[PDB]
Amino acid sequence: QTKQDKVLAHFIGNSTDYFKILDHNDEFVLVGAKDVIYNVSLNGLKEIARLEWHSTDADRELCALKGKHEWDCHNYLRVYALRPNGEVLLCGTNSYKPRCRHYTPRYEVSRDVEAQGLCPYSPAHNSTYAFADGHLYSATVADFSGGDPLIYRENLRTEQYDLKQLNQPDFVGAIERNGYVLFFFRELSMEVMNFGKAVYSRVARVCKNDRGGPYSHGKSWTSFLKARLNCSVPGEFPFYFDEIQAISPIVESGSKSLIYAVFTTSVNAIPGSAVCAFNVDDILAAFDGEFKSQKDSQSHWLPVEREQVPKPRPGQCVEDSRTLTSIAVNFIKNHPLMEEAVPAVHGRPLLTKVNLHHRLTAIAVHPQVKSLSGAYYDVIYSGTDDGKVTKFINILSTHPNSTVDRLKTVVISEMQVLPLGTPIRELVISTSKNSLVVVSDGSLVSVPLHHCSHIVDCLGCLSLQDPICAWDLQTHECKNLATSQHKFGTKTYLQSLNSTKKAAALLCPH
Amino acid sequence: NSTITNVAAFDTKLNHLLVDTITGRVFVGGVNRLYQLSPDLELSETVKTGPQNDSVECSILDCPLNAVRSPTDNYNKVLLIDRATSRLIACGSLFQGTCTVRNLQNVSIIEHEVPDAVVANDANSSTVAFIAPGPPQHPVTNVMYVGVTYTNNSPYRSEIPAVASRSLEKTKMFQIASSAVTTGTRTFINSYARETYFVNYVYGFSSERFSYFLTTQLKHSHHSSPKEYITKLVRICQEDSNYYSYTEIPVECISDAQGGTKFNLVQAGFLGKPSSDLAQSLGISIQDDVLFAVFSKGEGNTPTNNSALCIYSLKSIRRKFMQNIKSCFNGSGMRGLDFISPSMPCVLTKLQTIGEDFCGLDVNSPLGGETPITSVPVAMFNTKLTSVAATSTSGYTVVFVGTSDGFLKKVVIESSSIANEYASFAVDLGSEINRDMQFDNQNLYIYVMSKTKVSKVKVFDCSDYKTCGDCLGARDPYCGWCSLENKCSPRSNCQDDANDPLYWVSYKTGKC
Ligand SMILES: *[C@@H]1O[C@H](CO)[C@@H](O[C@@H]2O[C@H](CO)[C@@H](O[C@@H]3O[C@H](CO[C@H]4O[C@H](CO)[C@@H](O)[C@H](O)[C@@H]4O)[C@@H](O)[C@H](O[C@H]4O[C@H](CO)[C@@H](O)[C@H](O)[C@@H]4O)[C@@H]3O)[C@H](O)[C@H]2NC(C)=O)[C@H](O)[C@H]1NC(C)=O
Ligand SMILES: *[C@@H]1O[C@H](CO)[C@@H](O[C@@H]2O[C@H](CO)[C@@H](O[C@@H]3O[C@H](CO[C@H]4O[C@H](CO)[C@@H](O)[C@H](O)[C@@H]4O)[C@@H](O)[C@H](O[C@H]4O[C@H](CO)[C@@H](O)[C@H](O)[C@@H]4O)[C@@H]3O)[C@H](O)[C@H]2NC(C)=O)[C@H](O)[C@H]1NC(C)=O
Ligand SMILES: *[C@@H]1O[C@H](CO)[C@@H](O)[C@H](O)[C@H]1NC(C)=O
Ligand SMILES: *[C@@H]1O[C@H](CO)[C@@H](O)[C@H](O)[C@H]1NC(C)=O
Ligand SMILES: *[C@@H]1O[C@H](CO)[C@@H](O)[C@H](O)[C@H]1NC(C)=O
Ligand SMILES: *[C@@H]1O[C@H](CO)[C@@H](O)[C@H](O)[C@H]1NC(C)=O
């Protein structure tokens, strides 16, 4: 059915633990697991260091006492941050009793304290965080029962049990940007007056210089705003992928900053996955438009009347948010949702997989791979829930078959990396080692980022349609253009990306 | 009248009444006023608390544009005494529900003025406050448990909790006693139910390491069901500094008459001790507590003239709370209290020793019980009952009941099944008797407060029964008849020097 990929290294643990990439460089990666955290070299996926932290027997008997199982009552490490002083911030679920520690140098415990609101209770990939400018921004639950979602920083949280700010969310990522912190998640829909247990995906925002409102507002955000993400197929017959699954770090594709995301359809719907990309400027620009009106007993009204917006627009970052008015802070706490939806790049998904057997689950991008013609293409890697990795680019052929520009998906390879059933949780790219680290629940596998060296046939080199591999005609070797040097006026190298895959093969003589 | 001893008529409408348990001084809180009196209702001090310029749209510090402060009345909502530190607490309706701290010897003196919004700023929205042990420290410091109805007249009203513990420390006066990031000594009603689902707090009391609130409220938060009003009982462990133990069970006072009769609306409550005979019926010791409450059948939220008197022992209240808690922790049903946060299913738990003292955990924390504590009333009435008080100075428990028409009735409770009126007379005709109705320190006089007056009523008077058929005919449990002397009087007043044991005879044990 599917060709297996050439596995370079692997790092295996049990299936019982649950790996979460907590930090990644091109040289090293940190993996939080059941009772330890690993410092792993990307050179050979070899363990370099370890820090074990087990829940006390009394704390994990309390967990099983309150209705949990053995596999739930462990100390799943889920937050890491290197503090600016050389200190190490390390938090774990601690059998549904989350704790945070301060390791100082090897390491020795220097502080231990409760972590409610700073670190999830459950090892599920429900939460996220961002250690931005020496401050931990956390998005998780603060209660054992999981019904109090919040976004917490030092002395600032969202409104407890306020469903207009957060209605049963699942966080997928958090990005630092330009004095804001963006949170990506899927949420329950109460925005529309006729909501019926629908799930929509949001991007949220808080100012980093937020200090709370005046008087009683001093413990709550004065800048929390969210917008819906639009990953739909346009046309007369729209098709929406409303449940966001994974995001990527910000990717610098030329002059545009982009965030790539994986979306899927809801349960009991036509099963399907998609990949979309959103400009960082489009995300921020949505927070400058109208606000969406709150629910009333009439439920027949436009977005917020623009006469109710205060003179200093809510959401902007003021130097002292404690100087705002009760009118202004109460407004933004009752209108946290923007009216406009963040549009997608090219206005459509970059890849779609509808009514297939598998679903997409993770995303990673190798930006700005210069092709043979000198065009820059982002190479997109998306893993499936059955252990495959799809590689592809997008070509924007200008007027190839109609007057409106047509976007096309060029699939480079879709190979099996993990055993046939195992879900791919995350992806980490090392452009240096030309390696792609695939992360499952209990393993890390590395595969080649680009397969130019492996192929030896002319048909294969052109049918691959990788923007970085091209067939030489002086040398019979299919070569990697990152290390090679073409000169634009030589018929030596051969590459075909815009055509079909069979048409690329016809370029091969004999 | 000889049964009524002193009568004090006041110039304003009166709201609350308390008696100092050791000095017997009387404190009366009213509209725009605040009075202090001696145990004989002689006026000592009077304090003018209003009117002042105030708008409901404005706080003390800021007044939004196009809104103007206007002179408004100051309804007294809380009246309390702190015993550890001699100081009186009085809260008014103005300025978003502000409390003042006044000296106990002289109420005219203000010792501490707080700006914190603590109490309902409405004139008719309930507010219940009592002082009892609590956090931050282990139970050596007392706190103020407050329950406030959402007046729905200001944006500043969302800031005020519905049930909360509040500190009595001079440094942190009236702040929430213990508060952290995700939890504290506080319960709010959610943004979606806050303006529609109101809670009426009737009575508050502390008993055996738990704080209690007697409430009337809608049975359901969602609009899926027709509006039914029920009486609930709100509880919190006093060691609990997280309100993990916030729990509610409904309270049913059910009657046989007209097929099914439910007295759903409670009007007043009183916590007191039983008598030798009554304690045997309830299966409790004489030192145990009994809750006395008067319920009225209500057309919607309005009480009708069809009331009943119901008693509840706190052993059966604690065993009913335990019954609802045990059931949730066994995985059955839904957690309840959907008006705090959306109601999630009860979790199955390995808990093996949930008892009457259960003090709460992270799991199944805000629990709403559906199994009610049920009682059959010992008496029913053709008028709306508005107060209740119980004394067992005699060998029997006598319950004092106030009427919305101004009548005082006495009921003697011999069992959980048998009780009947033996006295009934008007104290202030045409004037509803206030809920705050308290006894003297010896339980010899009872203070009955109507709209504008307070009456010191003698609990019993056996001397006015001349002949003996009148003494035993009055069927007064306080009154017997000495054989030798021609006096009607209690047992202690006769002299057992007579050889016959029939020297003092009761109204049902013998014939005169
Ligand atoms: C996972 O495990 C790996 C391997 O154990 C860790 O990688 C090592 O991390 C340590 C700590 O950061 C590194 O030590 C630091 O090296 C810096 C550079 O060293 C090179 O360059 C200098 C000259 O510039 C040469 O002399 C040297 O031989 C190296 O060639 C130093 O600049 C650092 O010193 C500074 O910082 C310390 C700490 O604050 C100060 O006390 C010093 O005074 C000075 O200011 C420091 O010595 C080490 O080099 C890393 N090794 C490798 C192979 O990369 C990972 O850190 C670990 N994972 C995580 C998340 O920590
Ligand atoms: C996710 O992203 C997609 C694509 O970016 C959005 O799809 C767009 O949806 C909007 C509205 O839902 C569409 O705009 C609508 O066009 C209708 C007809 O357009 C034709 O007619 C105009 C006339 O000038 C032509 O110029 C045009 O080329 C088309 O031929 C209008 O009827 C719509 O109503 C509005 O305008 C009319 C006319 O002025 C008014 O009478 C109405 O009251 C109203 O103001 C509107 O203009 C747009 O075409 C869609 N694009 C695509 C590519 O499909 C999704 O809506 C978005 N999803 C979310 C949730 O944000
Ligand atoms: C405010 O109080 C003043 C007394 O100082 C009074 O004259 C005035 O009428 C009040 N304000 C309004 C709007 O009535
Ligand atoms: C009580 O306080 C008032 C106001 O301070 C004062 O006028 C009075 O003299 C004080 N003492 C008595 C006994 O009234
Ligand atoms: C408050 O209650 C009294 C007596 O029931 C009534 O006269 C008055 O109108 C009520 N006020 C409001 C604002 O409902
Ligand atoms: C109920 O009884 C009181 C007597 O105190 C009276 O004021 C009221 O009008 C009565 N209501 C009805 C409906 O009989």
Same-domain status, A391 and A470: no
Question: Could you identify the residue written with the tokens 């049975």?
Answer: B219
CB B95 within 8 A of CB B53: no
Residues 6+ apart with CB under 8 A from B318: B208, B210, B356
Question: Could you identify the residue written with the tokens 């705002």?
Answer: A324
Nearest to B181 among A66, A67, A117 (CB): A117
What is the distance in A from the centroid of ligand 2 to the CA of A191? 21
The token pair at A208 is 């980093």
Residue type, B275: S
What is the distance in A from the centroid of ligand 2 to the CA of A296? 27
Range of the domain at A268: 1-451
Cis peptide before A467 (omega within 30 of 0): no
Identify which of A274, A153, A135 has the alpha carbon closest to the alpha carbon of residue A204. A153
A451, A480, A498: which is the final residue of a domain?
A: A451
Residues 6+ apart with CB under 8 A from A340: A227, A286, A289, A290
Nearest to A330 among B155, B340, B344 (CB): B155
Same-domain status, A460 and A444: no
Same-domain status, A140 and A287: yes
Concatenated DSSP letters of B304-341: EEEEEEEEEEHHHHHHHHHHHHHHHTBT-SB---TTTS
Residues 457-476 of A with CB under 8 A from B: none
CB contact under 8 A, A147 and B344: yes
Domain positions in chain B: 1-461, 462-512
A4 alpha carbon, distance to own chain's centre = 26
Question: Could you identify the residue written with the tokens 């929205």?
Answer: B125
Q: List the alpha helices (DSSP H) in A341-403.
A: none
User: What is the C-alpha separation between A433 and A435, in angstroms, rounded?
Assistant: 5
User: What is the C-alpha separation between B183 and B405, in angstroms, rounded?
Assistant: 45
Find the helix or strand (DSSP H, E) in which B233 lies.
strand B229-237
Whether A157 contacts chain B with CB within 8 A: yes
What is the distance in A from the centroid of ligand 2 to the CA of A303? 17
User: What is the C-alpha separation between B437 and B26, in angstroms, rounded?
Assistant: 12
User: What is the C-alpha separation between A87 and B488, in angstroms, rounded?
Assistant: 87
Identify which of B200, B215, B211 has the alpha carbon closest to the alpha carbon of residue B235. B211
Concatenated DSSP letters of A127-166: -EEEE-SS-EEEEEE-STTS--EEEEBTTBBPPTT-TTT-
User: What is the C-alpha separation between A88 and A136, in angstroms, rounded?
Assistant: 13
Angle formed at CA A180 by CA A174 and CA A185, multiple of 5 degrees: 30
Question: Could you identify the residue written with the tokens 């390696």?
Answer: A435
Same-domain status, A186 and A59: yes
User: What is the C-alpha separation between A397 and A393, in angstroms, rounded?
Assistant: 13
Q: Which ligand lies nearest the alpha carbon of A241?
A: 2
Count the neighbouring beta carbons within 10 Å of the beta carbon of residue A421: 8
CB A483 within 8 A of CB A469: no
Q: Distance, in angstroms, between A164 CA and closest chain B CA? A: 9
User: Which segments within A189-255 are labelled E, that is strand?
Assistant: 199-207, 225-228, 232-233, 239-240, 243-247, 251-253
Concatenated DSSP letters of B404-456: TTSEEEEEEE-SSS-EEEEEEEESSTTSPPPS--EE-TTSSEEEEE-SSEEEE
Same-domain status, A480 and A419: no
CATH superfamily of B462-512: ligand-binding face of the semaphorins, domain 2 (3.30.1680.10)
CB contact under 8 A, A67 and B191: no
Contacts of B64 in chain A (CB under 8 A): 326-327
Burial class (CB in 10 A: 0-12, 13-18, 19+), B391: buried
Count: domains in chain A: 2
Q: Which residues pair with B272 in a beta bridge?
A: B290
Output helix, strand, coil percentages for chain A, rounded to the nearest 5: 10, 40, 50
Give which of B62, B182, B186, B189 to mutate to test A binding, by max A Cβ within 10 Å.
Answer: B182
The token pair at B122 is 């409405």
User: What is the C-alpha separation between A91 and A79, in angstroms, rounded?
Assistant: 5
Q: Which residues pair with A88 in a beta bridge?
A: A82, A103
Give the gyration radius of chain B's Cα atoms: 24
Same-domain status, A421 and A485: no
Angle formed at CA B192 by CA A124 and CA B201, multiple of 5 degrees: 115
The token pair at B457 is 């009523």
What was the structure determination method?
X-ray
Distances (CA, A) of A220 to A203, A322, B181, B342, B472: 19, 11, 11, 22, 70
CB B74 within 8 A of CB B51: yes
Count the neighbouring beta carbons within 10 Å of the beta carbon of residue B404: 18
What is the rounded end-to-end Cα distance, in angstroms, of chain B? 27
Q: Distance, in angstroms, between A167 CA and closest chain B CA? A: 10
Angle formed at CA B390 by CA B385 and CA B392, multiple of 5 degrees: 155
Contacts of A162 in chain B (CB under 8 A): 190-191
Residues 312-351 of A with CB under 8 A from B: 325-327, 330
Count the neighbouring beta carbons within 10 Å of the beta carbon of residue B371: 13
CB B43 within 8 A of CB B8: yes
Identify which of B119, B82, B124, B121 has the alpha carbon closest to the alpha carbon of residue B104. B82
Same-domain status, A476 and A351: no
Distances (CA, A) of B356 to B78, B237, B318, B325, B328: 31, 11, 6, 10, 15
User: What is the C-alpha separation between A64 and A286, in angstroms, rounded?
Assistant: 45
Parallel/antiparallel/unpaired status of strands B247-255 and B373-375: parallel
CB A447 within 8 A of CB A472: no
CATH of the domain at A412: 2.130.10.10
The breaks in chain A (C to N more than 2.5 Å) occur after 105
Whether A301 contacts chain B with CB within 8 A: no
Q: Which residues of B163-191 are buried (b: 16+ CB within 10 A; e: fewer)?
A: bbbbbbeeeebbebbbbebbbbbbbbbbb
Q: Which sign, positive or negative, has the C-alpha torsion A157, A161, A163, A164?
A: negative
Question: Could you identify the residue written with the tokens 């260091």?
Answer: A49
Burial class (CB in 10 A: 0-12, 13-18, 19+), B291: buried
DSSP one-letter code for A314: B
Find the helix or strand (DSSP H, E) in which B508 lies.
none
User: What is the C-alpha separation between B434 and B90, in angstroms, rounded?
Assistant: 18
CB A53 within 8 A of CB A101: yes
Residue type, A231: C
User: What is the C-alpha separation between A161 and A153, in angstroms, rounded?
Assistant: 17
Chain B residue with Cα closest to A220: B181
The torsion angle over the Cα atoms of residues A103, A105, A110 and A115, rounded to 10 degrees, is -10
The token pair at B222 is 């969602």
A431, A451, A471: which is the final residue of a domain?
A: A451
Same-domain status, A469 and A354: no
Q: Distance, in angstroms, between A27 CA and closest chain B CA? A: 38
Instruction: Kindly state the greatest CA–CA separation across chain A.
Output: 81
Burial class (CB in 10 A: 0-12, 13-18, 19+), A383: buried
Q: Which ligand lies nearest the alpha carbon of B53?
A: 3
User: What is the C-alpha separation between A478 and A377, in angstroms, rounded?
Assistant: 19
Contacts of B156 in chain A (CB under 8 A): 326
Size of chain B in residues: 512
Burial class (CB in 10 A: 0-12, 13-18, 19+), B499: exposed
User: What is the C-alpha separation between B392 and B398, in angstroms, rounded?
Assistant: 6
DSSP one-letter code for B471: H
Burial class (CB in 10 A: 0-12, 13-18, 19+), A311: exposed
A412, A435, A451: which is the final residue of a domain?
A: A451
User: What is the C-alpha separation between A18 and A426, in angstroms, rounded?
Assistant: 12
In B, what residues contact A, Cβ < 8 A?
Answer: 59, 61-62, 64, 155-156, 159, 180-183, 188, 190-192, 340-342, 344, 347-351, 361-365
CB B252 within 8 A of CB B326: no
DSSP one-letter code for A346: G
CB B250 within 8 A of CB B231: yes
Cis peptide before B250 (omega within 30 of 0): no
Burial class (CB in 10 A: 0-12, 13-18, 19+), B141: middle
Residue type, A289: G
Same-domain status, A473 and A444: no
> What 3-state DSSP class applies to A291?
strand
Q: Which residues of B416-441 are buried (b: 16+ CB within 10 A; e: fewer)?
A: beebeebbeeebbeebbbbbbbbbbe
CB A117 within 8 A of CB B182: yes
Angle formed at CA A130 by CA A449 and CA A111, multiple of 5 degrees: 120
Residues 6+ apart with CB under 8 A from A489: none
User: What is the C-alpha separation between B478 and B275, in angstroms, rounded?
Assistant: 13
DSSP one-letter code for A322: G
Identify which of B442, B375, B397, B421 has the alpha carbon closest to the alpha carbon of residue B280. B397
CB contact under 8 A, A65 and B348: no
CB contact under 8 A, B365 and A161: no
The phi and psi torsions of A127 (rounded to 5 degrees) equal -125, 175
Parallel/antiparallel/unpaired status of strands B229-237 and B210-218: antiparallel
Instruction: Kindly state the greatest CA–CA separation across chain B.
Output: 87
The token pair at A261 is 């995301």
Same-domain status, A58 and A184: yes
Angle formed at CA B231 by CA B228 and CA B232, multiple of 5 degrees: 115
User: What is the C-alpha separation between B343 and B367, in angstroms, rounded?
Assistant: 9
| Residues framing ligand 2 (Cβ under 6 A) | A 230, 232, 234-235, 341, 343, 347
Same-domain status, A171 and A252: yes
> What 3-state DSSP class applies to A241?
coil
> What 3-state DSSP class applies to B276?
helix
The 3-class secondary structure across B167-192, one letter per residue, is ECCCCCCCCECCECCCCECEECCCCC
CB B56 within 8 A of CB B63: no
Parallel/antiparallel/unpaired status of strands B367-368 and B247-255: parallel
CB contact under 8 A, B192 and A330: no
Same-domain status, A102 and A154: yes
What residue owns the CA closest to ligand 6's atom 2?
A: B383
